[PDB]
């Protein structure tokens, strides 16, 4: 039984934990039975003998900080004094722990690791912004367990207290805004959650108002996050400014169109999946044979999608599948589980009308302002392929998506109806030109579809229904 990670009788011994425990032993042996100056003298002498030695001491002190709260302040002081690489090796192991081990990290160590990161930020350690981003990635969307909520609030408190430092990094501002705008949606239904949500709201609003042009690098998906929190009073006010006074946010911000015509970086789409979610989704989309997906979907569903609070996660997964996962031609031609089949599965797991509606919009988000010189066929193809392949086994899925596509055009934002119609038109034309679907008429005028739905399609897009 180690002190760093939780382990059951069933669990194999962790190599990273094993190594860190040996580093700690090396440190404690050179510091046992001596003063505090004699200890620092020996550590300094040893560290100077090379970088493998430097690594052992730095990681040993690091591990003491995580496992021994009574010694942590002293060990952090000693770490800062002996470090010869600007604490690069420590930040590396922190990121590795966060990316690979967080789910097994013991409670004491999680607490200590947040304390440590706060210290690194205060010290202005190089790469601390990257550690904060890696830490945020571990806050799971659609998860209101006590441990997850604790992390959301712990990270937020660091960012709030060290806001002046936060302001030094444009990308950290945008990542923090993206992350917390999304988390705000999950934080209701309890006193603790109400308190947390208000803190997140005030934090995001402040960055949005003080640094709007930095936040604007997010692009189109920022609008999606903002519409999802639109009924919160501070965001109603922000939306009024976005629509009526965009120059008040920034003289470089002309209005909402500018944001909607700029596609979102994969960096943002990926940050809202934890590492375990990415690993499992990437595996399903690269290694699982079509027709063999049931148990994998069951496993994923049980871990990530089996609560009412978890419904919000579906939209993050959909955007990720559509905007991040772009399988190679080899995979595309093989019998591997296609992206459309995963989307179809995710759609059917919606337990509420709200979650279903949000999921449909997320699926279509790149269609709305689609431009073939910018946006990729890969982003819009799952929606059309879900519709095509569902027609025979699940016609209701096809029908609901076709109805959504028609209704979203005048409604998404009425003053931009002409742009949205042009986006959907361009998406469909691109789908045909790229031979994703060589002909739309067999779909838009399929005999299995309700005739009134087909009349609406022919009214909207007569050029495609012949």
């Amino acid at each position: 039984g180690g002190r760093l990670l939780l382990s059951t009788s069933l669990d194999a011994k962790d190599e990273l934990e094993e190594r860190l425990e040996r580093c700690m032993s090396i440190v404690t042996s050179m510091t046992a039975g001596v003063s505090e100056r004699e200890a620092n003298d020996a550590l300094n002498a040893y560290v100077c003998k090379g970088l493998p030695q430097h690594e052992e001491i730095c990681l040993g002190l690091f591990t003491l900080i995580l496992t021994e709260p009574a010694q942590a302040q002293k060990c952090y002081r000693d770490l800062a004094l002996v470090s010869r690489d600007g604490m690069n090796i420590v930040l590396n192991k922190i990121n590795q722990i966060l990316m690979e081990k967080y789910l097994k990290l013991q409670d004491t160590c999680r607490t200590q690791l947040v304390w440590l990161v706060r210290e690194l930020v205060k010290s202005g350690v190089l790469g601390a912004d990257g550690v904060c981003m890696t830490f945020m990635k571990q806050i799971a969307g659609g998860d209101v367990t006590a441990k997850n909520i604790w992390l959301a609030e712990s990270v937020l408190d660091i960012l709030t207290e060290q806001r002046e430092w936060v302001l030094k990094s444009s990308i950290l501002i945008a990542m923090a805004v993206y992350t917390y705008l999304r988390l705000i949606v999950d934080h209701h239904g309890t006193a603790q959650l109400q308190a947390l949500r208000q803190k997140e709201v005030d934090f995001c609003i402040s960055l949005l108002r003080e640094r709007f042009m930095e936040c604007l690098m997010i692009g189109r998906d920022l609008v999606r996050l903002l519409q999802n929190v639109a009924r919160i009073p501070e965001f109603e006010l922000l939306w009024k400014d976005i629509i009526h006074n965009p120059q008040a946010l920034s003289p470089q911000f002309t209005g909402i169109l500018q944001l909607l015509q700029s596609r979102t970086s994969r960096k943002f789409l990926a940050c809202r999946l934890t590492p375990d979610m990415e690993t499992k989704l990437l595996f399903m989309t690269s290694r699982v044979r079509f027709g063999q997906q049931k148990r994998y979907q069951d496993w994923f569903q049980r871990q990530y999608l089996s609560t009412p609070d978890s419904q919000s996660l579906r939209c993050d997964l959909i955007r990720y599948i559509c905007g991040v996962v772009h399988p190679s031609n080899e995979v595309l031609s093989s019998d591997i589980l296609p992206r459309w089949a995963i989307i179809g599965w995710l759609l059917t797991t919606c337990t509420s009308n709200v979650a279903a509606s949000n999921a449909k919009l997320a699926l279509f988000y790149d269609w709305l302002f689609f431009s073939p010189d910018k946006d990729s066929i890969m982003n819009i193809e799952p929606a059309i392929l879900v519709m095509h392949h569902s027609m025979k086994p699940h016609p209701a899925i096809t029908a609901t998506l076709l109805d959504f596509m028609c209704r979203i055009i005048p409604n998404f934002y009425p003053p931009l109806e002409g742009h949205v119609r042009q986006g959907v038109f361009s998406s469909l034309n691109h789908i045909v030109e790229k031979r994703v679907l060589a002909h739309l008429a067999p779909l838009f005028d399929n005999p299995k579809l309700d005739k009134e739905l087909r009349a609406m399609l022919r009214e909207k897009f007569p050029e495609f229904c012949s």
């Binding site: 009308n353 709200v354 509606s357 609901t400 409604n411 309700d450 739905l453």
Partner: protein
């Protein structure tokens, strides 16, 4: 049925979601749509 169906769907969205929604007379499961705020 059908205005009553729209009313109920919108009420459920308002109760549990901070998103902006409008109603539609959809016969295909789109009684509400998430859209941009209208002033």
């Amino acid at each position: 049925h059908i205005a009553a169906q729209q009313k109920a769907a919108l009420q459920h969205a308002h109760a549990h979601s901070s998103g902006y929604f409008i109603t539609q007379d959809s016969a295909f499961g789109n009684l509400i749509l998430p859209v941009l705020p209208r002033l």
